[PDB]
């Protein structure tokens, strides 16, 4: 029967406080998902090029790839703000040390299929007849047979507002590209560079169609498509950021001259350099605090802005994101620059899209203009030619320092994970099916070792015109759309924090200049400006 | 045996998360309590007067009373910062809606009695011989036979730091005073005023001695005096402050002109005054929003700075403390002005004592220069003689307005309780043994309907000189002191907050200009500047 | 009650609500808290071209006072009282002749018996939420029945968005199919 | 239904049923509309104080909390004539 | 809802008060002119209380053959007294 | 508490407290001096 409802809209985030501190954050989400029909039902391998990199010097501007455009649309839950309004994400940045991840279920219910029909009067008048008999095709890829494409790094998820109706995005995935871009040049001189994408190699062209991979449930207007409860197996995230560094690990040296006056303008003085004792990593006698004996370095000098070049094309090496120094650099420390849409933040007036250059606040980051390197003997009051200051060029290039090439990722390199980004970051991510797994993902903090949860493919079934369908490239169809609700349930599990100290830590407050970032205006303009995550401090040693 | 320890120093505040949200805040406290001997062992009824009020016009400056000075010293737990460091009181202002109060136990253990002895050499040299045989007198008033005198409104509690050794204060209580201060005068003219305290009346002189009321346990140097676990019976406090007022209770009137532009400089316009409908409390036809139909008024106009005069003397009427208006007035709204000692806050340098004029933030307060009164007919565009603006004098006194005399405490007066003040406020309070109990206490938010917990009286037993003790007013004694530890355990019970909304509420943060209020300096200077309490908002209707 | 007393709170200026009670034989109704309930054409009000009906009301529980009929005296009683010893309501307060002592004068002592709010028909309110405050009010002027527990659930109804073919991303206002609804609503309010 | 129980107690079971014509919301966006007026901005009209801050939601509220919904005057004449006390017991709503 | 059975009623839009910080002083008479300030100020941070309907109460979608039944709410109220009192302090007690 | 305590017999001589601005405690006004008239008392007894 059509006139019977099939599901319940639900969006409350139940913080069900279990014993011993553990909580069970059951986060629901429900949005009307307005699906339009596919503009073409034929699968298309669209090679993409650009004339922008074909002129010399614009080789960062490299948009060329080979794209497999499918008519199927993807309903995506893999974004943080779908499940958490800022009132409930304030509760977790204030109070939770760890976040485990447990359950996940999707549900499409209460689909409304409609036929639009044009009448030929003096305005364009469109009549919305109701389809009682048409269907739409859903496909829960319960094995992840298809390439897992999360829409969070493109900000193409469902919109993070409950009342605003969202849109699902077209499923598409990378096909093999064999990129020719060399020679790599400067900007000033002209070169005979070749900017073509070549023919795809035979051994790797990987064409997944949706019909021959996942079984597809047709759904009439009284449907209820229930995904089974996916149980995660992830590492427990740690929301508590670490502040200790290699000038803060271990036991400090004792001081003989201790201050007498109030105010921190006066400083206590240690013992002499050659008179101190302990274990030490160099040859020289004087034990300063810079060259000390620290267990492992936190962070690592990434060779930054380093454009590697693989069969796919030129690409920048992703840096583990970490809190910058007191000098805001953010490029060798891996800043996030997340541009949203008008479903994801961004007060809906006539301006362009908001930006928010972000960082975490886990203090483990370095500065490129603050580092230096020396010769093998230590030699305080060092020789001009024995120490490599960052004023020195590399190969005669004055803007380029040693740290552009210098990598220090040794085995003893402790490192914090990716911060979860709000509301625009990604929640979970597919484990890279490689022989050597990466230790952490920069795209998402939760890593699924098992089969990741099924991405959901939704497409309108072809409602066909009376016209013939043999020996024709493109058929006519009845123009149509859909309005199906979508209910999720993402059950977290988190441990409450315990204050084991004296001074009160930084909590996510609400200032007088902050309520305008949290309240609607006279029009209805909403905004979801980010939250700098990982507020509770913790010790790394 | 002397050389065996008797107790355990303990100061951790265990937040033991029970189910369904309830927590059980078990707050311990342990401080070394340095007791000096009493300067006299005789009970003294000291009448107090002052020559300051005997000259005309200084009649607020009224320090005269009749005091009963006892040699017993009182160990007091009834203050908030004894149990809560700011790291754990940040956790409760951020996360707890209600606070029930359950248990309380005291324990004096590990007393160290010492004899000081002067030798007659060229400096004053003092030799600290150890007393293995002397005793000190403890007295747990388990029935509150004695007058309950909390030391929190005088800031005479134990100091709120664990490492700093505290001091107990001398127990003393008010005796009957029959005060003569009239005539009450101005300052300018001179009058023949009489400033004497008279002879105490026969029917009410109430002389409690400590020995004939509470049984007293003598304690040698290997003692363990354990108070039984007192179980409270109090109302559950509500930490969530209310913001709704009589311009915010109920259902707002609907508007026809709704705004179009971004920005709150443009305002929506309601319907006409005479065209609106509903229930209404006056005779006139026009239904404005000022004269509306609201369930009960929040707050009440206290006749403020009102010096009542009772058999005891002149005293100001205590006002229920409530958040002031946008115009900071704080005197008709009952501000707290808490001056501390160097055990209670106050960076220990050469300055005088810190002040912090405080308020709660429960929005139910009024302003005296913003109120007015009218005649019985309503009459917008009111007659000059029909409306009482606060420019009008009362009896020819221009600074005094109608609101100095005006009281509006009707039966339908909803009202929030006393905010708990940190770290200097009082926790619990004795129920006033009167026929008509007060609805709330301004001194302390928790009210004990049963017998309140036993205040603890500690005094050194008389160590006597060889000199005779008959027919002598004052005997000589061996000068001595004591160092006894004191362990408490104040088991709270509180409900975790649940965020049922969108925008994130104001939490107690830590700014860059706030860490100096939470960290020690180069000397060792600590500080406990207050926390503006009751941060979570809630609806009153 | 200090009547027509405009208190002023963070919200704004507002009149102190008076417990409604039957006026004196002299109809005053303003220090006694009259109801002046203006209705719509669904709530009373013969549906012709006139404006909205008014009905200045009162209960008939005889416990009300009159402001022009009260007076105050000095501490000794002194029948045939001195001109300066008794405060008649012809006397101004601060030089304001229309304003009497009773505009400021409050007499709510502890021994003040008082009747509740009358239920008003058909336009009055039945039940009301208990004010979630630390000190609860003794009575509500808005409604005679007070729910100490969780009050009954108010019912929110809205049409689900029936959307146009037009796109719904990067747009402030979307077009919709214009629509309405006719749902019946059955209640059952069991008294005793 | 005036269901006369024993000893005087009655059990006034009052039903009510109305067709509730719901129109669609004119906007689905939540709006915080500050309200002011120029009427109190000139001196002396300070009773005429319509200014507040209003949170306009698109949801519509079906309300039973009024007396005449449940009682026609023929049945409220019966209770003002004959009943000393009114307790209040039950309440159920139903959209169908 | 309207108090007539046959007339179809209308439900009203749900809206609620947000925090307002009102500036209206000085309070004046009518006759003289003053430099009064009539602005609503920026809402304070500690109390802005924005309830949305979707994130608070679970919502039942209903097709054209629905039946949404609220459970029977049981009150706990004081018994009202319809009997008005007439005695006053010139009518309490025993007359001389 | 008082610092100047009496020495002579008879209640014609009165003990003197500390200064007004030097005393401490919780207090219901704005001013610095903590007299005994404006003090912090739990509830008033009686009513005008």
Coordinates of C-alpha atoms in Angstrom, one line a residue, chain C residues 1-186:
Chain C
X1 CA -0.6 44.7 45.1
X2 CA 1.5 47.7 43.9
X3 CA -0.5 48.0 40.8
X4 CA 0.4 49.2 37.3
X5 CA 4.0 48.7 38.5
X6 CA 6.3 48.4 35.5
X7 CA 9.2 46.2 36.6
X8 CA 12.1 46.2 34.2
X9 CA 14.1 43.0 33.5
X10 CA 16.8 42.0 31.0
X11 CA 13.9 41.3 28.8
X12 CA 12.3 44.8 29.0
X13 CA 9.6 46.8 30.9
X14 CA 6.6 44.7 32.1
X15 CA 3.7 45.1 34.4
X16 CA 3.5 43.0 37.6
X17 CA 0.8 40.4 37.2
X18 CA -1.9 40.8 39.9
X19 CA -3.8 37.8 41.3
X20 CA -7.3 38.3 39.8
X21 CA -10.0 38.7 42.4
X22 CA -13.5 40.3 42.6
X23 CA -13.4 44.1 42.7
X24 CA -15.2 46.3 45.2
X25 CA -18.7 47.8 44.7
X26 CA -16.8 50.6 43.0
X27 CA -15.6 49.0 39.8
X28 CA -11.9 49.6 39.6
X29 CA -10.5 46.3 38.1
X30 CA -7.0 47.5 37.5
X31 CA -5.6 46.9 41.1
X32 CA -7.7 43.8 41.2
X33 CA -6.4 42.2 37.9
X34 CA -9.2 42.2 35.4
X35 CA -9.2 40.1 32.3
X36 CA -9.7 41.9 29.0
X37 CA -9.8 39.1 26.5
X38 CA -10.1 40.0 22.8
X39 CA -11.0 37.0 20.7
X40 CA -11.0 36.0 17.0
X41 CA -13.8 34.9 14.8
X42 CA -13.1 31.3 15.8
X43 CA -13.3 32.0 19.5
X44 CA -16.6 34.0 20.0
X45 CA -17.6 37.2 18.2
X46 CA -20.6 37.2 15.9
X47 CA -19.0 37.1 12.5
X48 CA -20.4 40.3 11.0
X49 CA -18.5 43.5 10.0
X50 CA -17.8 44.7 13.6
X51 CA -14.4 44.6 15.3
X52 CA -13.5 42.2 18.1
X53 CA -15.5 41.8 21.3
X54 CA -13.9 42.7 24.6
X55 CA -15.6 41.6 28.0
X56 CA -13.7 43.2 30.8
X57 CA -14.1 40.4 33.4
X58 CA -13.5 39.5 37.0
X59 CA -14.1 36.5 39.2
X60 CA -16.6 36.7 41.9
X61 CA -14.4 35.5 44.8
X62 CA -14.9 38.4 47.2
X63 CA -11.3 39.2 48.3
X64 CA -10.5 42.4 46.5
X65 CA -9.6 46.0 47.5
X66 CA -10.2 49.5 46.3
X67 CA -7.4 52.1 45.9
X68 CA -9.5 55.2 46.5
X69 CA -11.1 53.6 49.6
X70 CA -8.0 52.8 51.6
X71 CA -6.0 54.9 54.1
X72 CA -3.1 54.6 56.5
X73 CA -2.3 56.3 59.8
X74 CA 0.5 56.9 62.3
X75 CA 1.5 54.4 65.0
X76 CA -0.9 55.6 67.8
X77 CA -4.4 54.9 66.8
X78 CA -6.2 58.2 67.8
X79 CA -9.7 58.3 66.5
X80 CA -10.6 61.8 65.3
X81 CA -7.2 61.7 63.8
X82 CA -4.7 64.5 63.2
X83 CA -4.5 66.0 59.7
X84 CA -0.8 65.1 59.4
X85 CA -1.2 61.7 61.1
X86 CA -3.3 59.9 58.6
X87 CA -2.5 59.3 54.9
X88 CA -5.6 59.8 52.9
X89 CA -5.5 58.8 49.2
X90 CA -5.9 62.5 48.3
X91 CA -2.2 62.9 49.3
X92 CA 0.4 62.7 46.6
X93 CA 3.6 60.6 46.6
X94 CA 6.6 62.8 45.8
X95 CA 4.4 65.6 44.5
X96 CA 2.4 63.4 42.0
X97 CA -1.3 64.1 42.7
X98 CA -2.8 61.2 40.7
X99 CA -0.5 58.7 42.4
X100 CA -1.6 57.5 45.8
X101 CA 0.2 55.5 48.5
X102 CA -1.4 52.3 47.3
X103 CA 0.6 52.5 44.0
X104 CA 3.7 51.7 46.0
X105 CA 2.1 50.0 49.1
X106 CA 2.4 46.2 49.3
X107 CA 0.7 44.2 52.1
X108 CA 1.6 40.6 51.2
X109 CA 2.4 39.3 54.6
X110 CA 2.8 35.6 55.6
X111 CA -0.8 35.3 56.8
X112 CA -2.3 36.2 53.5
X113 CA -5.0 33.8 52.4
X114 CA -5.7 33.9 48.7
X115 CA -8.0 32.3 46.1
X116 CA -6.6 30.9 42.9
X117 CA -7.0 32.0 39.3
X118 CA -10.5 31.6 38.0
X119 CA -10.8 29.5 34.9
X120 CA -12.0 31.7 32.1
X121 CA -14.5 30.5 29.5
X122 CA -14.2 29.7 26.6
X123 CA -11.0 31.6 26.2
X124 CA -8.9 30.8 29.2
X125 CA -6.1 28.3 29.6
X126 CA -6.6 24.9 31.3
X127 CA -3.1 23.7 32.4
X128 CA 0.3 25.3 32.6
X129 CA 3.9 24.2 32.8
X130 CA 5.4 24.5 36.3
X131 CA 8.1 27.2 36.2
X132 CA 11.4 25.3 36.5
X133 CA 12.8 27.6 39.1
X134 CA 14.3 27.0 42.6
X135 CA 11.4 28.8 44.3
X136 CA 8.2 27.8 42.7
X137 CA 5.3 30.3 42.6
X138 CA 2.3 29.5 44.7
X139 CA -0.2 30.1 42.0
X140 CA -0.3 30.9 38.3
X141 CA -2.3 33.8 36.9
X142 CA -2.3 32.2 33.4
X143 CA -4.0 28.9 34.2
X144 CA -5.6 27.3 37.3
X145 CA -4.2 23.8 36.9
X146 CA -0.5 23.3 37.6
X147 CA 1.4 20.3 36.3
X148 CA 4.1 19.4 38.8
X149 CA 5.4 16.7 36.5
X150 CA 6.4 16.9 32.9
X151 CA 3.5 18.8 31.2
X152 CA 1.7 17.1 28.3
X153 CA 3.3 17.1 24.9
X154 CA 2.6 20.0 22.6
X155 CA 2.1 18.7 19.1
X156 CA 4.2 20.1 16.2
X157 CA 2.8 19.6 12.7
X158 CA 4.5 20.6 9.4
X159 CA 4.2 19.7 5.8
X160 CA 7.2 17.8 4.5
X161 CA 9.0 19.6 1.7
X162 CA 7.5 18.7 -1.7
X163 CA 10.3 19.9 -4.0
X164 CA 10.4 21.4 -7.5
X165 CA 12.7 19.9 -10.2
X166 CA 15.0 22.8 -9.6
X167 CA 18.4 22.3 -7.9
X168 CA 18.8 22.5 -4.1
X169 CA 22.5 23.1 -3.7
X170 CA 24.1 26.6 -3.5
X171 CA 20.6 28.3 -3.3
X172 CA 19.2 30.3 -0.4
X173 CA 15.5 29.7 -1.2
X174 CA 14.2 26.7 -3.1
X175 CA 11.0 26.5 -5.0
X176 CA 8.4 24.1 -3.9
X177 CA 5.0 22.7 -4.9
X178 CA 2.4 24.8 -3.2
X179 CA 0.3 22.5 -1.0
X180 CA -1.8 22.2 2.1
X181 CA -3.4 19.6 4.4
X182 CA -6.7 18.7 6.1
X183 CA -6.1 16.4 9.1
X184 CA -8.6 15.7 11.8
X185 CA -7.5 15.9 15.4
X186 CA -9.2 14.0 18.2

